[PDB]
Amino acid sequence: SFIEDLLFNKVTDLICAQKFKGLTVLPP
Amino acid sequence: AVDCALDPLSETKCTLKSFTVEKGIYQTSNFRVQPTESIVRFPNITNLCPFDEVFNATRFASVYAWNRKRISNCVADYSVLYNLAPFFTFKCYGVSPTKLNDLCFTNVYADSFVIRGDEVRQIAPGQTGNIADYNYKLPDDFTGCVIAWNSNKLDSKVSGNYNYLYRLFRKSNLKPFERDISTEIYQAGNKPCNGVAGFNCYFPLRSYSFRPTYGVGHQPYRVVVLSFELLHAPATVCGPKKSTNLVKNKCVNFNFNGLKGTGVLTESNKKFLPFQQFGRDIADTTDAVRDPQTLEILDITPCSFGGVSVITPGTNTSNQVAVLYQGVNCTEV
Amino acid sequence: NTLVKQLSSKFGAISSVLNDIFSRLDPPEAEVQIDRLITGRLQSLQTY
Amino acid sequence: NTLVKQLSSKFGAISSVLNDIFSRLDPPEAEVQIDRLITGRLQSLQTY
Amino acid sequence: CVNLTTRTQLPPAYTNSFTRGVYYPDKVFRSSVLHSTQDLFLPFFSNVTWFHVIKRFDNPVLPFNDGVYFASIEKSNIIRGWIFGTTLDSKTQSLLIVNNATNVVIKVCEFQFCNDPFLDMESEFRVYSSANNCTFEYVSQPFLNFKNLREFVFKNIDGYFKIYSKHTPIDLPQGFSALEPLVDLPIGINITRFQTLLALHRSGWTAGAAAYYVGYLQPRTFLLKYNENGTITD
Ligand SMILES: *[C@@H]1O[C@H](CO)[C@@H](O)[C@H](O)[C@H]1NC(C)=O
Ligand SMILES: *[C@@H]1O[C@H](CO)[C@@H](O)[C@H](O)[C@H]1NC(C)=O
Ligand SMILES: *[C@@H]1O[C@H](CO)[C@@H](O)[C@H](O)[C@H]1NC(C)=O
Ligand SMILES: *[C@@H]1O[C@H](CO)[C@@H](O)[C@H](O)[C@H]1NC(C)=O
Ligand SMILES: *[C@@H]1O[C@H](CO)[C@@H](O)[C@H](O)[C@H]1NC(C)=O
Ligand SMILES: *[C@@H]1O[C@H](CO)[C@@H](O)[C@H](O)[C@H]1NC(C)=O
Ligand SMILES: *[C@@H]1O[C@H](CO)[C@@H](O)[C@H](O)[C@H]1NC(C)=O
């Protein structure tokens, strides 16, 4: 919806550096 | 019994510490890629540098005027520093006196002098006494070696030797690696001594007067101290290691000028400029290196790794499993 | 980010990396430095 | 109260007071004693 | 050498430095990173001593407390070299740097100068009367209103003499200019005082005006920004 799109847009190399140390993020 | 490396179900059982596994998804372990080759890169310097005349010298200096020599741009060999004498003392702080043949140093410093027999223990980090605070002082973060050996047969003479002197009286303790050659008279009293001897006016030098007759704990000893500086630099001096051709785009283990690691080496696009040797990253680890035989920059990237999970129903129902590799596009497993 | 940045600490050892510690000291003596580093890193990860 | 009281325990060193440790014995073991005290106090702060 | 009593007493000018005296402190590459360092730097917005030379002769003797930031605004290369030492006689070692016609020469040993040393288009090079045996010598490629701004930083620590340099084409101006390291020297001397060197030629005749600024370094903590390349931009 319109409001959902606005809310989604409102909220937003380091990842590779963290991954090379052994810390990962899992998907929902 | 269960073999923990036969099939994924056995690995899951070995991780869970049970002979029955129920329905679910379990995280077993991680997968890596092992190295295949090995390379070593060292500078092409082949000449040697002065170690014979430092030890095989005629006359060493006094304690207060200890001799200092700088050693650089050579190839160091320490095998010859074994047969100095039948018995000698060799103590290294910060390094072990067996592994210093495959280490690369920036600059070497050699300090040589001659010490009373029982004061050898006073050439050490953070020790007080007579010569450690008035003649020769060492820092508390020392990284080097100390060598001491007997010199009765060479230094002591029957006719009398008085060419070796030390200092006994001084205002304040010396800064580390600081020398004094002053001869101005001591001023214990309140009146000037007008440059003449007298009470409270003592000449701040003393003699040894070594004779072949004193006890085993009083003969002169010859002492040499080696100081290193293990930091980031062009690495002017280091020892006898054979080089090998370098490989690229393959997970191998490498030894670049003393830096050991494992990974993949790739051509680099970083904008290095003349004085920059290597580089770092956000986490303060080495990322780029410079080969000390071609002056080109290479990037280091650890080879592929990831996580493995096992999906199985209960062992009561079936022994079939499925394998999930996390975060990898399996066209490039 | 702070968990990543903790990796540069020395925890009283002679260096913040392991390979140079293992390439400069004999096995009898490197154990103390390795133990210090391991204990520090374990404590950091547990706190996280 | 317990945080304050934790300041007077040796944690395996010669004494709680550190100037006495520095004056009595040489830096090589004083470093170990200081490290012990620092680790203990940091652990107490973390628990608090 | 001759003695003259025509000098006019006048204190040197005092000016301020805004954001000058930033140099690379380590030999390591970093890209797009904020870093913190603790080293001998030049405090921001700090007063510095300004001498103007055109007649009037201004080559005083200045201390060497911890380090020197030496800046020169100039045209036609009047400022030539540098003398460093403790007592400035034959009783102690002295370091000497002179820019040749197409080379630079650096040497450390005993020397002898007059009470007001100077340099006499160059055909005669007579700055020192005597020179005994010298320990370290070095020869290298030349280091090169007012149209030239040259910045140099001289340090002496850990038994090494460090020279950092930077040049720019254009009362110092604003802006930021990092200084790349130039030379390291293994000298190991006492060093307490120094004195500059300018070139004068007999010649209606017009004398090029030059100005140079002296500032002193202190231990401070800085926060530096590295951009996408290895360039310090703030
Ligand atoms: C030593 O330097 C020369 C000249 O750059 C180079 O060609 C040679 O490969 C170097 N030595 C080794 C073992 O690579
Ligand atoms: C000193 O002389 C002996 C005599 O044979 C020799 O073997 C040795 O290599 C020389 N140098 C040193 C450092 O001992
Ligand atoms: C520098 O010194 C002059 C006089 O010596 C003084 O007037 C000026 O305020 C000083 N600079 C600063 C920033 O205080
Ligand atoms: C370089 O300068 C030195 C100053 O000591 C001088 O002796 C030498 O002749 C100069 N060389 C040239 C090519 O001008
Ligand atoms: C330089 O000469 C002096 C006196 O001739 C001498 O004492 C000294 O040892 C010499 N130094 C060198 C490095 O030749
Ligand atoms: C440098 O020379 C001065 C002049 O006498 C002296 O006071 C000072 O002690 C010397 N520096 C050192 C480190 O001795
Ligand atoms: C880095 O260097 C490139 C030239 O290769 C340049 O185009 C770019 O603007 C530089 N990045 C800066 C100045 O941030």
Short mmCIF file of N, CA and C and ligand atoms in Angstrom, two decimals, chain B residues 271, chain E residues 227-231 233, ligand 7:
data_model
loop_
_atom_site.label_atom_id
_atom_site.label_comp_id
_atom_site.label_asym_id
_atom_site.label_seq_id
_atom_site.Cartn_x
_atom_site.Cartn_y
_atom_site.Cartn_z
N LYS B 271 46.09 2.19 -4.82
CA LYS B 271 46.96 3.28 -5.26
C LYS B 271 48.07 3.50 -4.23
N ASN E 227 40.71 9.19 2.51
CA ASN E 227 39.68 9.05 1.49
C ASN E 227 39.81 7.73 0.74
N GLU E 228 39.15 7.62 -0.42
CA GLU E 228 39.17 6.37 -1.17
C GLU E 228 40.58 5.95 -1.54
N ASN E 229 41.44 6.91 -1.86
CA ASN E 229 42.86 6.64 -2.07
C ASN E 229 43.59 6.85 -0.74
N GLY E 230 44.92 6.79 -0.78
CA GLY E 230 45.69 7.01 0.43
C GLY E 230 46.01 8.47 0.66
N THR E 231 45.00 9.33 0.56
CA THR E 231 45.17 10.77 0.67
C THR E 231 44.47 11.26 1.93
N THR E 233 42.63 13.93 3.70
CA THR E 233 41.85 15.09 3.28
C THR E 233 41.37 15.96 4.43
C1 LIG F 7 41.82 8.75 -6.38
O1 LIG F 7 42.65 8.77 -7.55
C2 LIG F 7 41.92 8.80 -8.79
C3 LIG F 7 42.94 8.74 -9.90
O2 LIG F 7 43.34 7.40 -10.16
C4 LIG F 7 41.06 10.06 -8.84
O3 LIG F 7 40.29 10.04 -10.04
C5 LIG F 7 40.14 10.12 -7.63
O4 LIG F 7 39.42 11.35 -7.63
C6 LIG F 7 40.95 10.00 -6.34
N1 LIG F 7 40.07 9.99 -5.19
C7 LIG F 7 39.94 11.03 -4.35
C8 LIG F 7 40.77 12.24 -4.67
O5 LIG F 7 39.19 10.99 -3.38
#
